[PDB]
Amino acid sequence: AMAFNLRNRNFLKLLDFSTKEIQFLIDLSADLKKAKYAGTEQKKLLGKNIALIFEKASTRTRCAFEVAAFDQGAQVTYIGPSGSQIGDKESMKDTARVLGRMYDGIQYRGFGQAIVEELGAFAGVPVWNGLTDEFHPTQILADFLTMLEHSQGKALADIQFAYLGDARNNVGNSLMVGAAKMGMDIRLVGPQAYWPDEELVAACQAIAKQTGGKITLTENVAEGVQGCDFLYTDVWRVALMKPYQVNMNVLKQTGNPNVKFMHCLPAFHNDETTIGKQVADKFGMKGLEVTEEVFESEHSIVFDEAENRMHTIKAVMVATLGS
Amino acid sequence: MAFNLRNRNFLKLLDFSTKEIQFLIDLSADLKKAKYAGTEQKKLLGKNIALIFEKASTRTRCAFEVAAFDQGAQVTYIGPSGSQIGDKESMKDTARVLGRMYDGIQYRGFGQAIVEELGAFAGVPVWNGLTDEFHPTQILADFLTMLEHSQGKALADIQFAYLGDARNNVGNSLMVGAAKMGMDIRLVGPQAYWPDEELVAACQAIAKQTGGKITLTENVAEGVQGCDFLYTDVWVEAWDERVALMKPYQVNMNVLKQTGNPNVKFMHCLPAFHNDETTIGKQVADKFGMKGLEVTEEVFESEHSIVFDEAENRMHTIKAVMVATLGS
Amino acid sequence: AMAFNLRNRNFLKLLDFSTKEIQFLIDLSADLKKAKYAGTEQKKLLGKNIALIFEKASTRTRCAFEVAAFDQGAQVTYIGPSGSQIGDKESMKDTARVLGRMYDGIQYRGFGQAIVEELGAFAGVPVWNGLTDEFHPTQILADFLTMLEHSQGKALADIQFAYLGDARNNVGNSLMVGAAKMGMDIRLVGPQAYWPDEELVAACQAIAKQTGGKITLTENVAEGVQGCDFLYTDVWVWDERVALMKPYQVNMNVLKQTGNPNVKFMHCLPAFHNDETTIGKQVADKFGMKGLEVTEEVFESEHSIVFDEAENRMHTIKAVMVATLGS
Ligand SMILES: [Cl-]
Ligand SMILES: [Cl-]
Ligand SMILES: [Cl-]
Ligand SMILES: [Cl-]
Ligand SMILES: [Cl-]
Incomplete structure (x- = not known):
């Protein structure tokens, strides 16, 4: 057993x-x-x-x-x-x-x-x-349960997803390990300096070889998100990361009408956080790593993910x- | 229900x-x-x-x-x-x-x-x-406490005064509660520290329908006359002006006597500055030659005081x- | 019963x-x-x-x-x-x-x-x-249960133990009161300035006289520990205090001075016994020592009952x- x-x-x-x-x-x-x-x-x-x-x-x-x-x-x-x-x-x-x-x-x-x-x-x-x-x-176990619930009978090993922005941290690391273990296709989409630690990447590539998984590291959003079932981001420098914001256009670049949006929380998606009013001024943006439109859309499954x-x-x- | x-x-x-x-x-x-x-x-x-x-x-x-x-x-x-x-x-x-x-x-x-x-x-x-x-x-606890101590009288038959600073959560809630329950409430304090004028108007409208009464007064004797309950709360280098402004509204044995009611009871939401067994309480009382602030030790520890039943409730x-x- | x-x-x-x-x-x-x-x-x-x-x-x-x-x-x-x-x-x-x-x-x-x-x-x-x-x-109830569990049939009134270092504090005070109440033989072994409050000591001596207990206060380690079933210490902290307290460290030599093959070591915790803490290591390093009030060798030995004592x-x-x- x-x-x-x-x-x-x-x-x-x-x-x-x-x-x-x-x-x-x-x-x-x-x-x-x-x-x-x-x-x-x-x-x-x-x-x-x-x-x-x-x-x-x-x-x-x-x-x-x-x-x-x-x-x-x-x-x-x-x-x-x-x-x-x-x-x-x-x-x-x-x-x-x-x-x-x-x-x-x-x-x-x-x-x-x-x-x-x-x-x-x-x-x-x-x-x-x-x-x-x-x-x-x-967090990643919750994320994987949530993907399964929202992927209509597809198994983990069938799922493609992209993580956007700063991947050099616990949640990036874990998503990459998890994807490799479970045979998934994961793209890390962000500036090269913020990809995960190269030794962990190599260990994950070796695991992914055993499972049929794939790990792609890319600076290119359009190529990174194409065909993805999920898009995931987290808080994260601003000028550097801005191209990786999850907005409706990124959703549209997946080419997938059923794409879902995940975020481990908490998220800067509007003015209501105290940082939100500041930065909507401080860099002229309403929301950072994700927009209010995407976060509150029917594509967003962040609260099912939190419950899980x-x-x-x-x-x-x-x-x-x-x- | x-x-x-x-x-x-x-x-x-x-x-x-x-x-x-x-x-x-x-x-x-x-x-x-x-x-x-x-x-x-x-x-x-x-x-x-x-x-x-x-x-x-x-x-x-x-x-x-x-x-x-x-x-x-x-x-x-x-x-x-x-x-x-x-x-x-x-x-x-x-x-x-x-x-x-x-x-x-x-x-x-x-x-x-x-x-x-x-x-x-x-x-x-x-x-x-x-x-x-x-x-x-707090106000539900207070109303239960009043019913337990009023010998078969219903809330609609009870008269009570709140003393001091009413322009705050407890004052607001007491006024709403009294209006909803048809009670006779007196807010007794400096006019500047009555509850918000718009809320008062709203509560007057409710009281009109329920048979309640809301009186706002600076006059302690007139405010406490006939009360079943007297209620207060704390008022407070920075506090000198507020203590002088509020001092007339201290609940002492003399205020109890002014009710004319042998059975009057004293309530306080706590904590209370009633003696020198707190650092802040002693400091501020000393600064004015007082022993106790919003209420005196004599009242707080008397047989008229129900504050601990109220706290339990x-x-x-x-x-x-x-x-x-x-x-x- | x-x-x-x-x-x-x-x-x-x-x-x-x-x-x-x-x-x-x-x-x-x-x-x-x-x-x-x-x-x-x-x-x-x-x-x-x-x-x-x-x-x-x-x-x-x-x-x-x-x-x-x-x-x-x-x-x-x-x-x-x-x-x-x-x-x-x-x-x-x-x-x-x-x-x-x-x-x-x-x-x-x-x-x-x-x-x-x-x-x-x-x-x-x-x-x-x-x-x-x-x-x-x-703490002292836990200590006494622990002593009874590790003393092979002996009752509290038959037990002898020494507390080493700074006794002028709650744990020292309580150990002395408890020893007196239960008829035990306690030695407080440390510099005289760090013996328990003199009025409490007098009060405990009067209690001990009624129970058959004994209280000994001494600066001398060899005499203090001789015959002991248990040795107890606690953190004593810093340069002046360390030089003062260093002679009262519980090490394997102190264990040997008891003359008792079955001697056990107790400590209320936490303990500075090695360099696996920031504070413990800094202080021990400035003074050239590995552990303060007790050594790693004693603390991790089969004589140490500190984790039973903590559970209790x-x-x-x-x-x-x-x-x-x-x-
Ligand atoms: Cl978390
Ligand atoms: Cl992990
Ligand atoms: Cl309310
Ligand atoms: Cl409260
Ligand atoms: Cl004790």
Whole structure:
């Protein structure tokens, strides 16, 4: 069973999982989502206590862990940012061992991947990465569940998508790893200086060879987006990035009437954010990486994607800790 | 009535009919009794609630948490963050995301327009734990408290005075509530600190229909004469002018005597500056030779004071809001 | 199997309890630990709501309270450090009376013992001290359970232990009070300026005289540790303090000076035992040392019981809550 192989695993990065393991998590996320909506959800974390360590705040990721935990019968302790990071006055080795004695599972959101890998080695319970500098694996699981729901029977391995703008960061990295694992066709469309780290690219190309996937890095929007089922962006220099804004024209360049728009959030798409009025003045634009028109269109699936953060985090905890 | 309230927001008392408000108060009394008898039935089992506090209030937060726990719900407390909603992300976007994950949302914060936006976009019940303009949960607690302490009198038969600075959420809400419930309210304070003139006019129109009365006066003796309840709240180097302006409106034993009512009771939303057991309270009182500000220790700790029953009733009335709107 | 109970009592400091009452909290902690591990735990705080007030942050104490409560069926509101300290905008008497109307029990961690005593006088519900300037009673219950688990049939009154370094603080104070109450032999081993408050020492000597306990204060390590079942230390911090405290480092040589093959090492945590912390490494490096109050070799040895001791924070807080609020 992929189920037996996932028990007691940490969830630190998608590089640590096989194609089939990732597909299992996504399929479990879909089952849990269906069960919650039907009122038939079976609690598999009943009596479990979970610690949520946020060295950097993220309300979106925190809420997704909390609600998943509550729904599954667990209780949570939220430990927010504090000015004294782990490793300042107490080693991560020591912190991990103490937390592991008290809690049944631990989430960690913070800085370097090295820190969460250390937590994962010493806690003695499942550790789950809610974001590090290098990777954002729970986001990409949500993104993949969302693509499946909006791609009308197409499997991941059949899907083409482009990520626009600054790809040299956790969400870029993870999207590229995920695409390679699952056999997808991913284009990273942005200035060459902001493509992902070349060593990660090479590792992903090798994975993609095994899966039938494709990774294209390009400065050319028209060629990057052509034929895409999804277009994805994130916040991101302005003069440099402006050509990569997702507007209706980019949508039209895909040549695909069913193209959908994704964004991990939060997004600068208008004047209503405080930055929005500033920059609509400061560079004469209404919205940055995406326009209000695209964000609020029927092409936009950003809020289904946000909701799926909870279902996919729930699957991670249920697969690894669930009883 | 119960069916009318299902899935509604609780944003301000202006959004509710007389009978709905009476229903929420009666429910609060039932839930209080059930809790004390150990017969409380959980109606929020399995529900998840988000508590957004853009400005911290431990009192309101604890009332919401305890009410939720007692009813079988779970809570996520999201406290002040240095970035107010609308900085990195619009309230429209924040609402739509929270609304996908939670079953109910409390908001405590700044302008009424913000909570109204949250209430428009969330798609689940949104409850106002305080905004600049209104504090509706406090006033439900207050009205329950009055009914418990008025010996069979109905709200429509009650007379009360609010002393001091009325130009704020609690004053606004007390005036709306009184009008909706047909009560006789006196706002007693400097004219500059009466409630907004447009709201007053709106409340006069409501009061005309309900049999209520709204009197605004600078005259303490005339304002408090015949009252069943006297209500105040805090007024405040920067505060000297406000203390001198408000000092005539201090609730002391003499004001109680001016009611002519042996049974008069004293209410305060808290926290209160009634002695020198706070840093700010002692400082400012000392600066004027006072002991206690808006109310005296003698009144606050007397048998006439019901402030702690009133504070407790915060929880029972928040519980009723959540049960009526989200309960099943 | 007791004649008394602690129902509706506060837990403010060990001085407030008799020898038998302390023993009962320790025995209950053990039973609760056993039940959790066996999956037979019965929830005695079902339906109870607890407020956790931290004026000063302690993730370790907070997590212990939260897990204990969850395991027992209770729910919790964590009120962290916030810029409004109690007594700023509102008196403690007023805060206490409001919290006591809403919650079934209240933990307080903060500043002076006087504050928590006032809370405990006015709340009308049980109040538990998670740490004040003067006392750390929950830590010492965990320490005593840990000692009993690792001492091979010996009762507290038969145990001898030494606390090394800076004893003039809550943990030193509580260890001394507890040792006195339970009839133990405690040695406080450190520079004389950092022995516990002289009035408390006198009070503890009077208690010890009634229980068969012994309290020894000494600057001499070899004499202080000789025969000890346990060696305990805590962080002592900085140049003047380090030179002063350095002779009291727990290293393998101090373990050897006990003459006891079964000696165990305890530390309330966190500990500066190596260079895997920013603060620990900077300070140790400027002074040429790998670890401060204890060495890596001791801390990671089979003599070290610090992670059992950390786990036992939870079991013992659970006992305090069950005993005083449990239904
Ligand atoms: Cl995120
Ligand atoms: Cl990843
Ligand atoms: Cl209102
Ligand atoms: Cl309030
Ligand atoms: Cl103590």
